[PDB]
Symmetry: C3
Subunit: 249 residues, 3 copies
């Protein structure tokens, strides 16, 4: 049928966690080459795209491509049953009415069934060829900056010249984090490639959701274009989780 075993349930847990607080219901297409999924939020201001490759699984077998509609709050609830390092394996049939999530801890074990639903899959490819600027920084730093400036206001501005400035201007005060590219410990390097400069403003509400993809990666990529939704990538082991966020006009 279909069976996919995460060596540690922790991974799939963190993966769902990342876009859990973003969107509501989501379609999961499982193909021969692994699992892809996409969801757009309430206001259609934010899209989450997720690609999980075969080598992120301890084992992966999908004979017939299978889509799985899922309520994210439900799936998360089943995923808190958890116990982290334990082998989690999703199992679905040819035409499944439900997906089986099977936990095994090395001691012994539990099996759960999530009932799937029908969702219309209108899948978006809004990603561009070249974005005006492409930067990458430690996800932790980015997390900190967003969390700090989101104190001062609801709207955070990002400016790239070669200089990257983060600016919040509120009804209390303002704040500015200016950071510049360098190479060092490669995990801490701030990389920047700039074609034409960029000045873009985003809802902090959303950015705070985007940054909790920090649990999946050391580093975040950020690609920005003038008229386009900005793209925020957290790379997986053979995969990624990206957030497309439409700028404010």
């Amino acid at each position: 049928p279909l069976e996919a075993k995460f060596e540690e349930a922790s991974l799939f847990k963190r993966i769902i966690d990342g876009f859990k607080d973003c969107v509501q219901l989501v379609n999961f297409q499982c193909k021969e080459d692994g699992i892809i999924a996409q969801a757009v939020d309430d206001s259609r201001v934010l899209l989450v795209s997720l690609e999980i490759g075969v080598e992120a699984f301890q084992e992966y077998r999908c004979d017939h491509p299978v889509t799985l509609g899922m309520d994210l709050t439900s799936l998360s609830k089943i995923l808190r049953c958890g116990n982290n390092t334990d082998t989690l394996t999703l199992i679905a049939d040819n035409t499944p009415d439900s997906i089986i999530l099977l936990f095994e801890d090395t001691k012994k074990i539990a099996e759960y069934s999530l009932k799937l639903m029908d969702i219309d899959a209108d899948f978006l490819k809004i990603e561009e060829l070249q974005y005006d600027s492409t930067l990458s920084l430690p996800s932790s730093e980015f997390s900190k900056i967003v969390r700090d400036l989101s104190q001062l206001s609801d709207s955070i501005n990002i400016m790239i010249t070669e200089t990257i400035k983060f600016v919040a201007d509120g009804d209390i005060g303002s704040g500015s984090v200016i950071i510049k590219p360098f190479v060092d410990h490669p995990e801490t390097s701030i990389k920047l490639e700039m074609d034409q400069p960029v000045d873009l403003t985003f809802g902090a509400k959303y950015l705070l959701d985007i940054i909790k993809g920090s649990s999946l990666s050391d580093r975040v990529g950020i690609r920005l274009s003038s008229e386009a939704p900005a793209l925020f990538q957290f790379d997986l082991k053979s995969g990624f989780l990206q957030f497309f966020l439409a700028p404010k006009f």
Copy 2:
């Protein structure tokens, strides 16, 4: 290999009718989760995208994905043979030469080779998003079509204005969003990020409104420089029309 049974042939008939007279000839990709098909027209000003989910069928089985190239007029003519309550079943074998349409009389349509270049031009967010009775929309378009061959649309705050201007004269229809709690299917819905001013070909709008035979309501998403999207939702599915505006 592939067998898909509509409860009533009337549905497939009305779908194909819906985007017939719009586009030329169309590639139908049948997968495990059902049928998607796309076609662009003569001047490439209009694209039809169709998704039919698995639960719009009385039953559906597709073992391996199969594409079916089809001449829309040929298929339509074969679909004229329908009793509109007869149970239509499409059938294809592993590498189809032809597709069998079975009414309950059996027909065969010989397939064509077409190039599969497929278009995702849909956008994340559109400036304005409205929805209204497909009937009302078809009326407005049909009326304004009389006065000129170019119909313009303006979304303001709570204002939606349709305006035609030509040699004969000038029409204007103005509707506002409202919630009718007696009958929710007639309620006019509108969401607006930025206002929009967009002109479209009446020739094309007239083709687009023919999809009103599939749905109570039509959604309309308008972005400022992007092709406007007109959606008629189905039972587990939809038929959408992407129409490029006028410069």
Copy 3:
């Protein structure tokens, strides 16, 4: 599992040759209806899309979709063994550790290519309507690009008139051609459909890679839109497209 035979390895050879020195590596998705592949260059200025239909093969059987990650230089090297008249047959198994390229003649060599893991994030940037769509003999086009790329590293296009103009340090040059229909030889006719006029400047070095695709087709299609990447297509039951981002 997966078995695909080209009547002449010549074809697969010139296909890979076309985008070989353009892009870094490539992901080949083989499906029931045939092969598609996409690659972006390092500057992400140039995308190559490739569609090869079922009927570009002497025989084609793909039971279930299989993706094959490949190093282009490696593949090309294993394709240098081709006779250009030999029947090349690609073979891959359920989960593809390696692809088997099999050359055979009327008088047989079997090569194995180690497959890599590439993240496939595929782009659909193609538009509905392009401001201008023209088509000319690939021959002519390659000559024009080759000539103007002498005078400058930036070649400009202006569209019933099609003007190619390069202005560099040493000098400038202008080739102007107009749409015409030729009853004698339709393959040499230049066609133009213009909704809006277009003015676009491109990198010469990239256009020079793009014209390499001339070995695959009599004619090149060119679709130029104002803010968008221009689309250069060489047809094959299939095609090879080069999406090239204009310069600002």
